[PDB]
Design a protein around this ligand. Structure first.
Ligand SMILES: [Mn+2]
Ligand SMILES: [Mn+2]
Length: 175
């Protein structure tokens, strides 16, 4: 049984580890203790950066994110989201909320949708199974582009498994 804080650090992007290290410290969660959530954050992030037409919101400091949201919201006449999407899509002129779950796709979706009280925020969910779900059957990206996202979650799962780490990860998610 390996060290997740190891695997995370030596299996994600430096960039990605330290944006998520830094995302965590901001809620006073230690990456050394909260290592399963540490990886999850890194993965969720990695995905958002592969779904990139698209402006990125996840990853920025909250000050920077909220300003980013606002110039768009001021320039397009788009409703302000209450919370913070992950991306914006210039082609469909909408904000997108990205979700990566190790649970039920349907459960995670409705949890997302009911949080954000979206009218216009689009919601794309993937899991480590292929299983996915986008708001209104609107998959935004082309079967290929989504497929590469699918492949890599798979390459995350087994590489965890190689170290006895997959098992726990799998079962430790909540809402
Ligand atoms: Mn986000
Ligand atoms: Mn998200």
């Amino acid at each position: 049984l390996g060290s997740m804080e190891d695997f995370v650090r030596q299996c994600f992007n430096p960039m990605i580890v330290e944006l998520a290290e830094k995302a965590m410290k901001e809620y006073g969660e230690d990456p050394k203790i909260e290592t399963n959530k540490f990886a999850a954050i890194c993965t969720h992030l990695e995905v958002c950066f592969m779904y990139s037409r698209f402006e990125i919101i996840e990853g920025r400091d909250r000050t920077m994110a909220w300003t980013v949201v606002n110039s768009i919201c001021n320039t397009t006449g788009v409703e302000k989201p209450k919370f913070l999407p992950d991306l914006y899509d210039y082609k469909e002129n909408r904000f997108i909320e990205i979700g990566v779950t190790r649970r039920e796709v349907h459960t995670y979706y409705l949890e997302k949708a009911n949080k954000i009280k979206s009218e216009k925020t689009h919601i794309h969910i993937f899991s480590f199974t292929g299983e996915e779900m986008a708001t209104k059957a609107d998959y935004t990206l082309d079967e290929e582009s989504r497929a590469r996202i699918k492949t890599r979650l798979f390459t995350i799962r087994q590489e965890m498994a190689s170290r006895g780490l997959w098992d726990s990860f799998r079962q430790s998610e909540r809402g």
